Amino acid sequence: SLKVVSVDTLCCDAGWRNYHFVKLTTDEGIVGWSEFDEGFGSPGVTAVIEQLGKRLVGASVMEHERFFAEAYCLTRPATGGVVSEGIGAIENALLDAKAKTLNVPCYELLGGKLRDRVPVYWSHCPTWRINHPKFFGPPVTDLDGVKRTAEEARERQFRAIKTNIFIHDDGPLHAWRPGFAVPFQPALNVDRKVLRNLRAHLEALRDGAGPDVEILLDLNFNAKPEGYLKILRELADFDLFWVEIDSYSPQGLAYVRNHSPHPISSCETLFGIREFKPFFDANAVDVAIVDTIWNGVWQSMKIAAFADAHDINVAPHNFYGHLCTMINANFAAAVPNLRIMETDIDRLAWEDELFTHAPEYQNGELIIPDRPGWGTDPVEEAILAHPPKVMGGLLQYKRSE
Amino acid sequence: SLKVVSVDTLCCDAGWRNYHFVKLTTDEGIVGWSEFDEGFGSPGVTAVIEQLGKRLVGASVMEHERFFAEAYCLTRPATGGVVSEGIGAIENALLDAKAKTLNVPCYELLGGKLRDRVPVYWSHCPTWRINHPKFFGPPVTDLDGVKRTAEEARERQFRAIKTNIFIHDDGPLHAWRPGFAVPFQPALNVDRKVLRNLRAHLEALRDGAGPDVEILLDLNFNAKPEGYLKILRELADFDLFWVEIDSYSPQGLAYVRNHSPHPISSCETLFGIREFKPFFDANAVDVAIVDTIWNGVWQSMKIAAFADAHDINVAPHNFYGHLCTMINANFAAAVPNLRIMETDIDRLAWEDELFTHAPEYQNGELIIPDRPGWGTDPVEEAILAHPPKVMGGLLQYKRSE
Amino acid sequence: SLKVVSVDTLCCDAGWRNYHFVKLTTDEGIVGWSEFDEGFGSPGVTAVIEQLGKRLVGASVMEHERFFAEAYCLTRPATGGVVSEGIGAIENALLDAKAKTLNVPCYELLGGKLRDRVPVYWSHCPTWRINHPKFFGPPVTDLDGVKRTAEEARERQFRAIKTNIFIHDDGPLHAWRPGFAVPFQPALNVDRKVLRNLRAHLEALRDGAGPDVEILLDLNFNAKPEGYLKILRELADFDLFWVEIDSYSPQGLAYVRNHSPHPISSCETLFGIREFKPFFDANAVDVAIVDTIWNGVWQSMKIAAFADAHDINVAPHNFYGHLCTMINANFAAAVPNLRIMETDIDRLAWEDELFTHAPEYQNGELIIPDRPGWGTDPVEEAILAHPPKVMGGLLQYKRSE
Amino acid sequence: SLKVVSVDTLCCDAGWRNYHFVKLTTDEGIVGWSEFDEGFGSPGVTAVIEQLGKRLVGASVMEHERFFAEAYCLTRPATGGVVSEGIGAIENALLDAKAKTLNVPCYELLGGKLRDRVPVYWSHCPTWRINHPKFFGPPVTDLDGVKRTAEEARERQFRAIKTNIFIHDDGPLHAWRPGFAVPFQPALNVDRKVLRNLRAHLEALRDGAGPDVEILLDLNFNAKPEGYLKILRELADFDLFWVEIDSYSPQGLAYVRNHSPHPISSCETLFGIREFKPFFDANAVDVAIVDTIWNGVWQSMKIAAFADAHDINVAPHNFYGHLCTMINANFAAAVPNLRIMETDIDRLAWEDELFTHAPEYQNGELIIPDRPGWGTDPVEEAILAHPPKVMGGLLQYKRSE
């Protein structure tokens, strides 16, 4: 019949956060999967999906843009954010199911592949070993460990690494994340302490990385334009692949970029061409980060095309489980204007239990798989062996505090 | 202690949709309430509130902007929409509790009152009698009933009424709501049928209203700029108080307004100064609709001040239960630049059972109450006597179809 | 009755200028106070207050935004400047009275507090010891005294200091203030003499401050854009917390900022969102100075919210008596987007006689008090023991000349 | 010596407001005069003048731009409004004294005259006979009196008349002045009642004026852009010389003008090229009103030149005593780009007692005099025979209410 018979959500432990999944089944017995997240400031996504999936039952699994169009209509007033994440999660499950029904990898729905491998950067490096050492080891607790982590990246043939903001000289090593309320300093002022610690951290990372490995710096939402300018001027003499700055002020981000000696990336939290547009019109970015897990991969192809017309390359936002990596792999396979792909190389001890297939890296690149659908399936029995905790993510840093 | 002890949500039947409430209790035994909605495209608000309220327990009930600032940080990546609605619902409960603790009406927290009564328009008139006749009577099923409803508004001393788009000459009277997927025609084209039915409907309404009662026309998201221009040109010779058009294109809405012989209102679905700004910068509106139930009343005071600087008057979005009306009443009491206040005069048969106090109207104006807090409390026993159904609102029109 | 019974003004000696106060009494016997200034280019404020306060008698003390709205109407043609200062002074007295009536600190009217302490900078350092040595000692008369003053700031645990422009190598140490007619050189040209003396002064200050204490430079209105650029280029290699430039040309200030290696602050002389707007639209500032003594604290909350939407942090303008400090303390307690708070640490020998309570500093921060109202009351008997002189401020530098 | 020996202010009764004067005496015994106003929203001007005139004593009477430059410096922070009115009043007294010293009319200081007579409009017609009937008769209390007043204007050979907003069909004839708080309706909404009364009033005026006399409509600050558009659309079919709209939103006024079938005038409350600039840049006006009594005539020549470069004609703001008329006459004599000159033809019973010379009109034009100075002197004995009342103007309408 090609009809969708069911849309369900599943959830499992990922240590300091949960993983979430959409499971969609068709009349033919094909199962399409996606992975989504609630911990990155996104409570409610499951509820959105539960409501919207009810309308999908009985509809064609082939008609994903029909479903998008209908869902957009039905949630038009509160579009964006958690609503749009729910829609994107369902879209990604539909795509998997459609590809499987046609016996092709998902990239065959996206224009075909135009590359077989994708260069990555090792993300949250050493951020995960500092911030979640119970889950990702070896723990990093000082500048020497920062250096050693970059050395490890170099030895393992990764070509780039991304770090965040850390305070080394004021007690135990800790993250500076005021944009996410740790500490609670909502003006997000940047002082000498921040600047000297950024310098110390990046000098140690560079010492370990050597001169060839690229260093990316993510500042997230942790400053105002004033403070971002102060950081960029302080770090004017560093060799940075990019400086990543999230902002809801296209004019403010553009001002910062105009005064930056480094490439600027942004946009990981934005939805649709509509939200990216003011930033591109303002010349706000060198690189656009596209969260295809949030937007849905089909919507993300639209965003990538829009970026392409502005001669802006895009990078997928990818810092979740293996299924997200494979989802993003298919996007990266198909998009001409691809800057690079993010991935976390630090993995949970039980990561590989949760999925049928693990991503394969060789010489700093991700190998794009050629199996029907995204390239990996969550394993239901394994999900149930790792029951979820309460919401973590941005909420559990604040508990740890 | 002034500490928040608990944050709970409650839900009850409102016929074709549910009402939702936040109940916040302090160490002193004061209860603060707000009302929120999920049916207007907003699945997930309860989940957001459930997560965010956990951080609030143990904090001061007096420190509402502290809570806002923290909540904004913790949900920064997925801000807007359902996330921001959850934050606004909690804010409105905090304000009620704070006002009650200080033994003052909520307007005493908002600058004091500057008016004792507020002119209203009778909203969803005759929209509710056409679309939800099981709940709001007498049913309207033809042009004569449209006329009689406007006559009723005139007799009852209401000074203004707002209608939507209706098709009269193609079978049983029915709403034209393609922007919300009834019918599913996602291009939102406007054809002759739409235009001739708009004319027929508005002529009947004017016939009943007489020459003094004002007529507002809400087009919601039911067209593209092309179609909005076609409607405005068709209706160029009508006397309309305003034409309401929701748009996520500030440049497109500005173009439409620039070519409109009628005042244009918009913005009911927007959050924060940040989202209103591009519309004001573009000269997109005569009147800004502010949903204080969504934004929170404190955030809405910021939006009203911003509008004031642009010499734009604001109107509260108010089409829910009595508590929402009283919340909006307090906002309307305090804001200098107030255009008018929306209210639904068609009420559910059990509406007054659900709340301690009902809004009082005299000569087309709402009387602003002077009780501590918002002016009415939901009644827990009554809530439980009217158990909720599954989500309705935008989802149940589509079931009816 | 909650009625205002009287509005009076009081004035006392502050050495080289006077302090002024509004005293407002309610039917319940509550007294609300504010402090205002005439010496900073503002003759006439008392007269404005005397006229406007007459309309306030008999009105509710609770209805401050009503009074603002009415006063704005009654003075609409000549709004801004001295008129708006009079309105702001009355507003601040109303707020004190309202808070006292409700038995809460003023920050409880402003959203609640979100911080308990506020970092300050020591303003007019060493400006007051150079320019008014009869009142603030030890006198500073050379570069060594400049250095020692910065050392003192460091020892006393202040984290930042702000200086102005001084000429050291052309006779006795003297201020360069052509924007305020000392000397009378109304083109405000910047020559080599200015630049070399700025360098000499700042080098001495840095020598004393050490590397951790931040140095702010206030240039007031003492140049044209051409000259501001010359100063910024000369000082490109200094570590400056900000460079403060007052301008009535948003396009000119924006040009200067665009070419500045230092953060730029401005706006201390502006009134309302309306006046700040062209500067924010032009990307003219890193930091917005808000004079809440001038604007009124309620109006200033509107300005702070507007700034917040542009991701601009604000700093209160605070260089008067203890009551102004406490007024600003309450604003600083409540505003999320707070850059820093100005305060003068050099005090008059009789300062503490004039007020019931003095501000308390610890480790470079101001402690926010928790008494009803602003936190300090002027003492009538003490005011009368220090009778005012003729207007000083900007007028008495010109006498000294 | 050419030194200024004294600067004094004088004040006398003008019925519902006071007239104010600056009297400046030189070492040679020459007396220079100006007239200023406090009642049009401007409490404090006398205090400004009292302070600033102290610096002028001992300076050259010839050096008026020196004094301006110095005064601007000394009041830079609170410039505009009442401060700038005080400066302008002194400037106008300096000009009179300088012209008298050189034995020439003031226009000889302003480029020489380029016309001998100036067409006027009869302002506040029938506004003064409606609003201040105790002082200006015959009283106007109905539409017939409105018609008769326009007939009188026609018979007396005036070519144009200006009215304001009046309500005829809701009790005794009364002014609609919500922008000045009568009534207190600070949203400034425009409803049907306003529109139908505007129509009725203007139809009666046109009936009396006949087809040749021009009708100007002044809306002051009595609406928001939304409401101004509603008025202009309602009155689209009237023949109006201009519609006058005061606004502090150059973008809002520009929007209104862009949609106006009538010429738009504005700017009467603005100071300096700096304040006019955003309006001219925005294409906000057909005609710029320049208040030379406020700005000073020398500053106003700068404003007129600026307007000239934009091909905008200017009109003086002139609705005070005979000295203001003569001040404006000299400006009008000299400015090429002169639209028309305002004047009040309704005079107080004692007007001519207060001044040495009265303005002379012939065939709808003002004859420019050729006496040294402005053309008339206030008479000290007469001033003292008409002692002032408390401040009236905008404050006394509110008493009458």
Ligand SMILES: O=C(O)/C=C/C(=O)O
């Ligand atoms: O994903 C990041 O780059 C940072 C996350 C955080 O600070 O929570």
Ligand SMILES: O=C(O)/C=C/C(=O)O
């Ligand atoms: O609230 C309205 O105006 C329309 C709602 C709808 O068509 O669903």
Ligand SMILES: O=C(O)/C=C/C(=O)O
């Ligand atoms: O307050 C200041 O920064 C400077 C004042 C002055 O030079 O008069």
Ligand SMILES: O=C(O)/C=C/C(=O)O
């Ligand atoms: O001068 C006018 O045109 C109006 C003045 C007023 O309404 O007070």
Ligand SMILES: [Cl-]
């Ligand atoms: Cl989580």
Ligand SMILES: [Cl-]
């Ligand atoms: Cl902070």
Ligand SMILES: [Cl-]
């Ligand atoms: Cl619902």
Ligand SMILES: [Cl-]
């Ligand atoms: Cl369609």
Ligand SMILES: [Cl-]
């Ligand atoms: Cl002073």
Ligand SMILES: [Cl-]
């Ligand atoms: Cl000079």
Ligand SMILES: [Cl-]
């Ligand atoms: Cl007066």
Ligand SMILES: [Cl-]
């Ligand atoms: Cl109003």
Ligand SMILES: [Mg+2]
């Ligand atoms: Mg990032």
Ligand SMILES: [Mg+2]
């Ligand atoms: Mg609407």
Ligand SMILES: [Mg+2]
């Ligand atoms: Mg300053």
Ligand SMILES: [Mg+2]
């Ligand atoms: Mg006028």
